Amino acid sequence: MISLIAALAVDRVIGMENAMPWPPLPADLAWFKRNTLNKPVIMGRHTWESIPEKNRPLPGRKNIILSSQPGTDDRVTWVKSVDEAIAACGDVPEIMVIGGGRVYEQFLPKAQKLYLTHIDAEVEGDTHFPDYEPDDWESVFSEFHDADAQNSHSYCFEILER
Ligand SMILES: NC(=O)C1=CN([C@@H]2O[C@H](COP(=O)(O)OP(=O)(O)OC[C@H]3O[C@@H](n4cnc5c(N)ncnc54)[C@H](OP(=O)(O)O)[C@@H]3O)[C@@H](O)[C@H]2O)C=CC1
Ligand SMILES: CN(Cc1cnc2nc(N)nc(N)c2n1)c1ccc(C(=O)N[C@@H](CCC(=O)O)C(=O)O)cc1
Ligand SMILES: [Ca+2]
């Protein structure tokens, strides 16, 4: 099955100028790693270029990058369509789609699960997560956490299934 995972600040904002528009929340990164470890991850080229080299390729995961153009990094698998991205995952229990905006828009109609981090921050953005709440998603997990010394905004992890 196909799953999307995303951090959304207020009004579904997920990015600004190819970066996330809040300071790093290490607890959200630890949630991301927990949920994506040992699964293939599919990402657009802008998202691959936004991950610091210190954690690239994402370890313990098969990294699959969408680009219409030839690949520029032999360390990961490059693919030129959605169908090619899915094929490279192989027969596994769950495929994780990790962004960005144009990638999420294409995969949301195919997904049976969403892993969302809701961040209590009103920030400016140029990229939003697609409208999902109107469809037939039901929440099956949620967990709120207050801001602390290592995370400067409060956040709420959520899993929804179709
Ligand atoms: N808050 C969060 O959880 C996350 C936020 N983000 C943010 O999202 C933003 C990036 O999103 P966005 O600009 O939409 O970019 P994406 O990461 O979705 O990358 C889009 C690129 O991927 C390639 N691509 C997408 N679809 C196809 C396709 N069907 N066939 C071939 N190639 C395809 C294209 O590359 P090419 O141009 O080479 O053809 C396209 O330009 C950034 O701000 C980033 O920080 C990203 C991930 C998570
Ligand atoms: C910019 N980017 C995309 C990104 C960031 N936060 C997200 N958060 C959520 N919830 N979902 C996403 N898809 C998401 N994507 C990144 C940036 C860094 C790392 C990264 O360093 N990740 C380590 C996390 C370990 C760590 O905390 O350093 C990993 O192994 O996953 C991942 C994604
Ligand atoms: Ca590296």
What does this structure look like?
This protein has 162 residues and is α/β, with parallel strands linked by helices. It has a single domain, classed as Dihydrofolate Reductase, subunit A, CATH 3.40.430.10. The longest helix is centred in the N-terminal third of the chain and has 11 residues. It is globular and about 40 Å long. The N and C termini lie close together (11 Å). The site of methotrexate has 19 residues, from strand 1 and helix 1. It is classed as oxidoreductase.
CATH topology: Dihydrofolate Reductase, subunit A
Structural class estimated from helices and strands: alpha/beta
Give the overall silhouette.
globular
Q: What is the H/E order?
A: EEHEHEEHEHEEEE
Number of strands: 10
Bound ligands, each once: NADPH dihydro-nicotinamide-adenine-dinucleotide phosphate, methotrexate, calcium ion
Helical segment count: 4
Q: Can you tell me the CATH architecture?
A: 3-Layer(aba) Sandwich
CA-atom Rg in angstroms: 15 Å
**Subunit organisation of the chains:** monomer
The number of domains is: 1
Trace the largest sheet across and list its strands: 5-4-3-6-1-7-10-9
> CATH homologous superfamily name?
Dihydrofolate Reductase, subunit A
What is the percentage of strand-forming residues?
Answer: 25-35%
CATH class: Alpha Beta
Largest sheet: 8 strands, mixed
Q: End-to-end distance, in Å?
A: 11 Å
Name the helicity range: 10-25%
Domain DHFR: 1-162
Function: Key enzyme in folate metabolism. Catalyzes an essential reaction for de novo glycine and purine synthesis, and for DNA precursor synthesis.
Catalytic activity: (6S)-5,6,7,8-tetrahydrofolate + NADP(+) = 7,8-dihydrofolate + NADPH + H(+)
Organism: Escherichia coli (strain K12)
